[PDB]
């Protein structure tokens with residue numbers, strides 16, 4: 506099946522086509538039918554298998570646009586590094602053109618990021634230390650999050666962000682949809698499924 | 713998503729609708745895009761999940777009819793018991809009435825089944841012991857199999873069919889699509905996935 510065969514808004518498909526993307530990768534073709542229906546899932550696949558779109562397209566499809574100034578984000582994506590936060594934000598901006606995506610990460614001051622969050626955001630893509638910093642400061646508001654994504658959960662474990670991640674997830678509404686992506690599925694990932702997800706289906710691309 | 717969103721022929725859709733079926737179950741929803749494109753999958757699931765239509769629909773869609781006398785089967789489904797073979801064959805006929813489906817199982821005479829295989833078959837749903845007997849005899853020729861399904865692999869393991877199942881898969885062409893259903897993915901199932909499947913996607917709903 507091609508992207509056009511999936512229940513995706515015309516504007517999203519147009520963006521996909523423009524970016525040279527027509528046919529889902531295996532993780533995408535298996536995950537989208539469930540993720541687009543609002544279901545929780547765990548995606549286990551080598552990096553470069555197309556994991557980002559498997560959660561970006563659900564975020565894009567689920568969220569309607571909003572022009573309301575200072576609005577709080579309706580999606581949160583956590584990633585272990587600044588490099589990945591920038592990459593994921595780029596991709597999500599590109600397939601959710603109707604959404605404002607704000608990236609937050611270390612290696613710079615607070616001022617520009619706070620200014621962005623104050624203006625309003627529909628999705629935030631963040632490293633967990635910086636996100637928790639802003640949560641504590643009152644500038645990142647997670648009370649309206651409808652979709653939470655943990656991207657590379659095993660790297661977030663290996664960089665030591667367990668408490669930050671759990672703290673962030675705990676500040677989101679339990680009504681949310683949660684997607685967890687992790688190449689390996691260590692003990693921590695399993696704890697997260699139990700404690701933060703709703704009967705998620707596991708999709709694992711082997712080889 | 714609805715069944716009509718998937719690349720299924722209108723007669724198939726009409727039949728599902730006739731039975732009140734419009735909305736795929738989780739395992740069907742996740743499996744069908746890949747299964748209908750000929751890709752290998754492992755479904756971690758038991759009865760109650762809708763796993764049967766997850767492999768029956770791709771068979772029904774893939775295989776055109778043929779009236780060729782003596783023709784060899786193009787789909788093989790292995791199951792642990794007579795009971796399940798009868799159930800699966802029934803469901804395969806329900807969605808693919810254009811295909812000759814032959815159930816092969818123990819606890820009965822050879823004659824009927826051997827006759828049917830010699831006359832020609834499009835799909836065979838078999839228990840592994842009797843299937844291997846027919847393979848040995850040349851009665852069951854697997855050289856044209858396009859889809860191989862291992863239904864309830866844990867039960868096949870628990871009954872002692874590991875050797876028969878491996879040998880039957882070893883006799884099909886590696887170009888085939890293989891779909892494996894195993895509730896617990898024991899070590900044997902992992903062995904099968906490595907030896908007999910190609911980059912399988914695992915879908916666990918239980």
Ligand SMILES: Nc1ncnc2c1ncn2[C@@H]1O[C@H](COP(=O)(O)O)[C@@H](O)[C@H]1O
Pocket residue numbers: 525526527528529530533551552553554555556557558
């Ligand atoms: N459906 C697709 N077709 C072709 N390339 C894709 C598709 N989805 C993702 N990619 C690319 O796969 C690469 C790795 O993706 P990821 O696993 O998200 O890092 C990137 O170059 C993506 O643009």
Ligand SMILES: Nc1ncnc2c1ncn2[C@@H]1O[C@H](COP(=O)(O)O)[C@@H](O)[C@H]1O
Pocket residue numbers: 733734735736737740758759760761762763764765
């Ligand atoms: N999409 C569906 N909607 C409703 N019932 C279904 C669907 N798929 C399978 N079933 C039924 O679910 C029961 C268990 O299926 P199975 O898990 O294949 O043994 C059987 O009665 C099926 O016919």
Ligand SMILES: [Ca+2]
Pocket residue numbers: 610611632633634635636
């Ligand atoms: Ca950080």
Ligand SMILES: [Ca+2]
Pocket residue numbers: 665666667668669
């Ligand atoms: Ca920490």
Ligand SMILES: [Ca+2]
Pocket residue numbers: 509510716717
């Ligand atoms: Ca369509």
Ligand SMILES: [Ca+2]
Pocket residue numbers: 817818839840841842843
């Ligand atoms: Ca037998």
Ligand SMILES: [Ca+2]
Pocket residue numbers: 872873874875876
């Ligand atoms: Ca044996």
